């Protein structure tokens, strides 16, 4: 897991409020917050294009090697604040990180699926809770569904992991449900 | 790996006592010129206090543990009687004549009542 923590120039904020924040978003930045066991909550402005490149590249949970005030820092993206319509990025929380730490994480699965003909898939869940190392978070829990038949409830305690990564969502979950496929006459009797 | 099931009557009796004592306490008040006479009973011995509930402070005290009160020979009731004597003397030294009587979550009669009646006899106004 040879990750390249993306680098980003961030500058501390003068003004902290709604007017300033809208002016910032307008200019083309994104406000952001930094905290953790740093215990010194910093308020930053990132640049949205660079931030979006970083996310689109390495998934949403993606470590960062920031540059604050000339000094550099290490952070993880804990939470995003998105707009529904425009689908901008309004605000970003950032958890400081030392190397070798155990922080809980929530990543996305990937259904690589080609099934039997009489088969349909149903993704009951996207997001699974994990603890891992700092530099070693995945991007995609690949789950494969091929050769299988009708009902095969892929439990959560069935996915293949890295070495040194732990599942913390309960192993009861239906991540997938392989339904007996519908009839064209069954599609008349669903939601009427 | 033996394990119990539920409530013992010690717990029942205790929490019921606290229940009815803090029921009663709604009507009783405290003040340094009219304090509250709390009683706290056990099977063996007994304890009492004069309480000021304006500051949750205490002005007098007594109990049937002190050897000078164990120097009684007679019944539990007589221990209680001499206790009432001592607290009358002490209260009227520290400067309290009138009080109320909190039965502390116990029934009136027996040792409580004989205490209080000895105190009424020996001067306290209640």
């Amino acid at each position: 897991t040879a990750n390249i923590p993306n680098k980003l120039t961030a500058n501390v904020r003068t003004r902290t409020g709604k007017g300033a924040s809208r002016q910032a978003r307008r200019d083309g930045k994104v406000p952001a917050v930094l905290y953790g066991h740093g215990t010194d909550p910093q308020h930053l402005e990132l640049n949205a294009r660079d931030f979006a490149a970083v996310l689109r590249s390495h998934g949403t949970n993606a470590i960062l090697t920031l540059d604050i005030e000339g000094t550099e820092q290490l952070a993880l993206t804990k939470a995003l604040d998105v707009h529904p319509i425009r689908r901008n990025i309004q605000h970003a929380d950032l958890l400081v990180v030392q190397r070798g730490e155990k922080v809980t994480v929530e990543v996305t699965v990937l259904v690589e699926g080609d099934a039997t003909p009489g088969t349909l898939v149903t993704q009951d869940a996207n997001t699974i809770e994990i603890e891992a190392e700092a530099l070693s978070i995945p991007e995609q829990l690949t789950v494969s569904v091929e050769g299988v038949e009708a009902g095969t409830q892929i439990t959560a305690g069935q996915i293949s992991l890295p070495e040194g990564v732990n599942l913390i969502s309960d192993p009861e979950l239906l991540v997938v449900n392989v339904v007996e496929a519908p009839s064209a006459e069954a599609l008349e009797e669903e939601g009427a | 790996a033996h394990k119990p099931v539920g409530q013992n009557i010690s717990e029942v009796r205790r929490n019921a006592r606290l229940r009815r004592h803090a029921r009663l306490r709604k009507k009783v008040a405290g003040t340094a010129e009219v304090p509250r006479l709390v009683v706290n009973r056990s099977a063996r011995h007994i304890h009492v206090q004069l309480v000021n509930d304006l500051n949750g402070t205490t002005l007098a005290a007594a109990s049937s543990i002190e050897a000078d009160v164990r120097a009684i020979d007679g019944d539990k009731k007589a221990h209680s009687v001499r206790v009432g004597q001592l607290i009358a003397e002490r209260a009227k030294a520290a400067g309290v004549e009138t009080v109320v009587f909190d039965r502390g979550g116990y029934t009136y009669g027996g040792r409580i009542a004989a205490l209080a009646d000895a105190a009424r006899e020996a001067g306290l106004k209640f």
């Binding site: - | 033996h2 394990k3 119990p4 099931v5």
Partner: protein, 182 residues
């Protein structure tokens, strides 16, 4: 200055045997019967308000104490039942009177049931409280069994500080309830 049979027996043998069986640290953990309970649901309260008095008289003659008359706190009209209609009598038994009652029951009446094969070991609950039931009162020689005008059965239940069914059955065995030994 007196001792009932079952209680002397209890303090002599049974505590010892349960100690030698279950190996408690404190003897306070030893199981001990507390009380005995009796109930009679008349059920025809809305049709005979006089069988109630009959049952009261029977349990009086049987237990030597005036029962309690349990009222109906709820009103369920599918049975005619209304708030306060007396449906049943109930008696509590504690102490020497209890031990005497168990002596009599085990030694006179239960050896007078018709084709008594055995009381189940499965009338327990959670920890060992034995809740059985009698169809008729035609059995206690205590009763004047000439005057009875109807069957008026009852329901008995025996409660103990035992913590589980194994200790309960073992104790009641040592005390001499005719379980179905299985």
């Amino acid at each position: 200055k007196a001792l009932p049979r079952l209680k002397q027996r209890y303090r002599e043998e049974i505590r010892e045997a349960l100690q030698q069986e279950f190996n408690y640290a404190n003897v306070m953990q030893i199981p001990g019967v507390v009380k005995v309970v009796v109930n009679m649901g008349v059920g025809d309260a809305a049709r005979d308000a006089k069988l109630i008095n009959g049952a009261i008289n029977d349990l009086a003659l049987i237990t030597g104490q005036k029962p309690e008359v349990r009222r109906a706190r709820k009103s369920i009209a599918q049975f005619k039942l209304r708030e306060g209609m007396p449906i049943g009598a109930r008696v509590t038994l504690r102490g020497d009177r209890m031990w005497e009652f168990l002596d009599r029951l085990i030694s006179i009446a239960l050896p007078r049931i018709r084709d008594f094969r055995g009381l189940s070991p499965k009338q327990f609950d959670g920890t060992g409280n034995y809740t059985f039931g009698l169809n008729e009162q035609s059995m206690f020689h205590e009763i004047d069994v000439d005057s009875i005008d109807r069957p008026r059965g009852m329901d008995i239940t025996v409660v103990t500080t035992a913590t589980n069914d194994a200790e309960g059955r073992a104790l009641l065995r040592a005390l001499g309830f005719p379980f179905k030994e299985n």
